Amino acid sequence: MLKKKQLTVLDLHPGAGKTRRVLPEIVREAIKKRLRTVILAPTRVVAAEMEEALRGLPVRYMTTAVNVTHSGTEIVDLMCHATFTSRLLQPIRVPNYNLNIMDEAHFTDPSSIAARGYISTRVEMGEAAAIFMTATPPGTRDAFPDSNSPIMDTEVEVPERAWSSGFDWVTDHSGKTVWFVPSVRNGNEIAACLTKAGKRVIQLSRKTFETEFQKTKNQEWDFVITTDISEMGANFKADRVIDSRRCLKPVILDGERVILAGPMPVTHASAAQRRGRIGRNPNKPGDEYMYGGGCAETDEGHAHWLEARMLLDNIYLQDGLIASLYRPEADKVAAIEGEFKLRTEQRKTFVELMKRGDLPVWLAYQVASAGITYTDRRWCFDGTTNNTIMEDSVPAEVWTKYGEKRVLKPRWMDARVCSDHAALKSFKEFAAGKR
């Protein structure tokens, strides 16, 4: 598995022991062969779980999620998928790792797709080996894979709004349920409905994940309401999953705006990962999976694959060569390698708009490619009337860094900057010159 020019897909079913049993054995063999190795975790929660599975092995934890210190004699590094892609983009030398291990390799955020593309290109060049660990590799068509214990699969209408009647099975249940919703706003409405009915609810999303996930271990709860982020190796002591089978899809329209289309069907890989949260204990058969729609290949034309190409076009590989996307996911976007390659000063602005600005990749690219510098926010106010951002049915307003009250009307509109209250609050701070 560790021999050069080889990319292995470790696709044992969910709960088979890829992280706790297989990963430590791979790491011991890599250290025995003196292979400089990187281990990529999707989130800080998974990074902390990996430290427990690898306890005692000499691994350098490049994350504040773990408090270890480090002897300085480690040849194995562990960091998040986003951290790897970030360091490749920045003017910091990333070692040319002999072995590249990606856990939860099905993650479809732009930085995870870009990491797979870079790593698989190095393997294709004959420079390195790689191991992608996931039960659901790209293009998987099976939403119902094997599990540690039998699961009761039931197709049923699932609420996506508050309800007064017609869904007694949802609240009549005495165990713990993990419920996948298509958006933070949709989860807020379901959570309020369940709280009014006397249930204890925890809500999870990308921005709150680490803090709120701790509550699932520290307090008693009846429901966890979560977006698709919990598909990335998050584990729960639950006996039921309720799956809307829906997600939002970012879509670039006419190359000039990004909308959040849907909700629409999830992929088979997402459905198998949502279901895969239960049936994990061989001693507790009969965990339930209630699902409310079919699957479709909604990653085709999804903005994340075009955003992954924007990142890869701006990562040095060798001279003018540019890394390709990992072959099984390369047809998800219609893009020419190198079309998003920026000159040095515009590339530095693109990186800073993502790293410090916290803007979506597509929006950071529009601003940097237009020749605008990082601190210049005039573009947040000079768009057309149809780009006005709305807050509680009235235009959002901010005080500019000049002390002028203005309506938020960005030159390029990316729906992800106002998808929920937290995102719009962060974007208002950015438009005001506060970061």
Ligand X SMILES: C[C@H](Oc1ccc(-c2ccccc2)cc1)C(=O)O
Binding site residue list for ATP: 12-19
Q: Shortest Cβ distance from residue 65 to ligand X (Å)?
A: 6
Classify burial at 124, counting beta carbons within 10 Å of its beta carbon; exposed 0-12, middle 13-18, buried 19 or more.
middle
Binding residues: 12-19
Under the criterion CB under 6 A, does residue 6 sit at the interface with ligand X?
A: no
| Closer to ligand X by Cβ: residue 303 or 311 | 311
| Closer to ligand X by Cβ: residue 64 or 386 | 64
Separation of alpha carbons 109 and 116, rounded Å: 11
Q: Shortest Cβ distance from residue 249 to ligand X (Å)?
A: 28
| Closer to ligand X by Cβ: residue 64 or 385 | 64
Beta strand pairing call for 129-133 and 99-103 = parallel
Cβ contacts of 117 within 8 Å, gap of 6 or more: 308, 312, 323, 324, 325, 326
Q: Shortest Cβ distance from residue 161 to ligand X (Å)?
A: 37
Phi, psi (deg, nearest 5) at residue 361: -50, -50
Q: Shortest Cβ distance from residue 132 to ligand X (Å)?
A: 22
| Closer to ligand X by Cβ: residue 88 or 322 | 88
Q: How far is CA 250 from CA 106, 125, 164, 191, 359, in A?
A: 18, 32, 32, 24, 14
Under the criterion CB under 6 A, does residue 62 sit at the interface with ligand X?
A: yes
Choose one: 60-68, 140-148, 285-293, 374-382; the region binding ligand X (CB under 6 A). Answer: 60-68
Q: Residue 307 corresponds to which tokens in the numbers above?
A: 């955003």
Task: Pick from 25, 34, 56, 64 the residue near ligand X by CB under 6 A.
Answer: 64
| Closer to ligand X by Cβ: residue 45 or 325 | 45
Pick from 160, 149, 154: nearest CA to 188: 160
Q: Shortest Cβ distance from residue 60 to ligand X (Å)?
A: 6
Q: Shortest Cβ distance from residue 84 to ligand X (Å)?
A: 11
Choose one: 61-69, 195-203, 222-230, 280-288; the region binding ligand X (CB under 6 A). Answer: 61-69
Under the criterion CB under 6 A, does residue 324 sit at the interface with ligand X?
A: no
Q: Which of residues 67-86 bind ligand X (CB under 6 A)?
A: 83
| Closer to ligand X by Cβ: residue 94 or 191 | 94
Q: Which residues pair with 10 in a beta bridge?
A: 133
| Closer to ligand X by Cβ: residue 86 or 147 | 86
Number of residues in contact with ligand X under rule CB under 6 A = 6
Under the criterion CB under 6 A, does residue 90 sit at the interface with ligand X?
A: no
Q: How far is CA 421 from CA 260, 392, 426, in A?
A: 15, 10, 9
Q: Shortest Cβ distance from residue 311 to ligand X (Å)?
A: 17
Choose one: 11-19, 58-66, 214-222, 370-378; the region binding ligand X (CB under 6 A). Answer: 58-66
Q: Shortest Cβ distance from residue 62 to ligand X (Å)?
A: 4
Task: Pick from 13, 60, 207, 341 the residue near ligand X by CB under 6 A.
Answer: 60
| Closer to ligand X by Cβ: residue 72 or 166 | 72
Residues that bind ligand X (CB under 6 A): 60, 62-65, 83
